Symmetry: C3
Subunit: 121 residues, 3 copies
């Protein structure tokens, strides 16, 4: 499951390092995808370049997760809980402010190694 | 509805400030989501880091909007019109160059407060 | 089909220029969308701001492609192959490390020129 993440700006590397590290380790820990399938990208966002509720500058994370369809409401429900857990622990933010977004892609619609669709595996 | 936005780079803050402000106010004004549900993130893009039609460096906006499924073609159709309106007014761009992308997420597939899926509310 | 792209950081412009140029030319070359419909945005990502497999700093690309639904598994399958081809040729990376993500949007859910949904055309 490749992941892209927006966090409110202003963290040390190891925050935005260890977070990606146990984000990977939690993406394995969240069934399927050994390792080579997962990636995670962090892209910090400036205050006065974001708004939570209606207050510009409000700390935030949104995870968009692209996974290969065929997975269960409850394993997905499990991703969400452990990944909010990790984001909280190692990004030093609130549980409430992480918006994850689980996007299940079909094997013919993900272009992977060699540009052969994921289906062709 | 959390929002992520790519605009061609080169604006003053208040442009890329007031735009987010009435983008929020228009996201309320566009039925459902009181406030705490909405967020908006702006991420400006350099010329020669984007292309509209086939001409590198061409002013542009693309809004990706993540909303909770269950909403109507016409309220969505309403988002699009007022949000192109706002993007135009306060980002100082053309109507034609904003590409919005309405993505309706299911309540079990959005991880929100506490990492409990949105369904569990 | 508007495109957003994350590449591992560290390329010259013309890499991240010509890539967008034949990415456009290949998006035409991949049936439908004359030109004014396509856009492509590149957003480079720092090492220690990304992870492929579980190794922070690993060169990578992910293309998210937003296209208007109604297109065939095999033309999409064609996008993937030529666009991995182009990404490889002109971004100087491996075939295996590009993750594309084909997202087919419905004509009423894409807000385009004038903020009139794409359906209304």
């Amino acid at each position: 499951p490749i992941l892209q993440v927006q966090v409110t700006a202003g963290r040390s590397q190891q925050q935005k390092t260890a977070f990606l590290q146990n984000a990977t380790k939690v993406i394995e820990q969240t069934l399927n995808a050994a390792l080579p399938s997962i990636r995670i990208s962090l892209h910090e966002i400036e205050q006065q370049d974001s708004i939570v509720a209606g207050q510009v500058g409000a700390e935030f994370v949104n995870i968009v997760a692209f996974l290969l369809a065929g997975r269960n409401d409850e394993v997905k429900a499990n991703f969400l809980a452990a990944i909010n857990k990790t984001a909280v622990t190692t990004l030093d933010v609130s549980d409430s402010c992480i918006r994850t977004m689980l996007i299940d892609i079909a094997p013919e619609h993900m272009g992977v190694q060699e540009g052969l669709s994921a289906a062709a595996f």
